[PDB]
């Protein structure tokens, strides 16, 4: 019930998960800020596809895990993803922040 049991249980679940990585960004970001995030997003996409054996979704509505380019709170009300997150409040998919996803993969044995 502890250490790699958790890693092993996740590895199994991820083989049966659809993961979508978001296109939209949180408010007030510079071109560099966005680039740096995009590069990181790109490797997270690889770990999920290649290592965690998850299916990469091009539709965030058709996925069990949604990977954000920041915290959902920082996303504007008007963005497609925030709109979707808000409708899912009436019962769903797991909305992970950019930092949380980084933490997860690192615990899975895939550091950046």
């Amino acid at each position: 019930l502890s250490k790699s049991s958790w890693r092993q249980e996740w590895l199994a679940n991820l083989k049966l998960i659809s993961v979508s990585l978001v296109d939209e960004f949180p408010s007030e970001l510079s071109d560099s800020d966005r680039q740096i995030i995009n590069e990181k997003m790109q490797l997270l996409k690889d770990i999920f596809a290649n290592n965690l054996k998850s299916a990469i979704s091009n539709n965030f509505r058709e996925s069990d895990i949604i990977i954000l380019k920041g915290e959902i709170e920082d996303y504007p009300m008007s963005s497609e993803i925030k709109i979707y997150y808000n409708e899912l409040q009436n019962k769903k998919a797991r909305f992970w922040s950019f930092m949380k996803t980084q933490r997860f993969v690192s615990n899975m044995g895939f550091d950046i």
């Binding site: 502890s2 797991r94 933490r103």
Partner: peptide, 10 residues
């Protein structure tokens, strides 16, 4: 139903 974080035991 599964935790996103590993079992922290320290």
């Amino acid at each position: 139903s599964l935790d996103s974080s590993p079992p922290n035991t320290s």
